[PDB]
Amino acid sequence: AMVPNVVVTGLTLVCSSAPGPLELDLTGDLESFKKQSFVLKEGVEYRIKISFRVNREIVSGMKYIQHTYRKGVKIDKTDYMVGSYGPRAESYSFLTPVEEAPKGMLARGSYSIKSRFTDDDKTDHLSWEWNLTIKKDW
């Protein structure tokens, strides 16, 4: 502090067919997201974008982890290797591969995501929880 070396600042669902913005400001109140949700139309393509800042020194083996739950039941875990980053003025962005929202009536509904940004020292750069609601339409 009071400027940390690593600051995780945002999550964006990058989705060209979405009618509005799908952004979590991660510098604010993280708890607020648990009673909120991003709506995605079933079957649409999107990426998850993590925005973060490195301010003073090199960090190795940065890693993004998402655990997906449905009705409080864990259904999946995915780990994404972000890499080694040096300090820079401009924020960095990490994009996951393109994936598709679930599709079909049985796969619709609400999902919760537990996200974590870490490194090879297992530093908790940020941990947060957010929701996805899969719908027939926007």
From Swiss-Prot:
N6-acetyllysine: residues bearing it: K41, K63, K77, K114
Site of covalent link Glycyl lysine isopeptide (Lys-Gly) (interchain with G-Cter in SUMO1): K74, K77
Modified sites of kind N6-succinyllysine: K77
GO MF annotations, alphabetized: GTPase activator activity; Rho GDP-dissociation inhibitor activity
Job of this protein: Controls Rho proteins homeostasis. Regulates the GDP/GTP exchange reaction of the Rho proteins by inhibiting the dissociation of GDP from them, and the subsequent binding of GTP to them. Retains Rho proteins such as CDC42, RAC1 and RHOA in an inactive cytosolic pool, regulating their stability and protecting them from degradation. Actively involved in the recycling and distribution of activated Rho GTPases in the cell, mediates extraction from membranes of both inactive and activated molecules due its exceptionally high affinity for prenylated forms.
Associated disease: Nephrotic syndrome 8: A form of nephrotic syndrome, a renal disease clinically characterized by progressive renal failure, severe proteinuria, hypoalbuminemia, hyperlipidemia and edema. Kidney biopsies show diffuse mesangial sclerosis, with small glomeruli, hypercellularity, increased extracellular matrix, and contracted/collapsed glomerular tufts surrounded by immature or abnormal podocytes.
Annotated protein name in UniProt: Rho GDP-dissociation inhibitor 1
Protein source organism: Homo sapiens (Human)
Lineage, broadest ranks: Eukaryota, Metazoa, Chordata, Craniata, Vertebrata
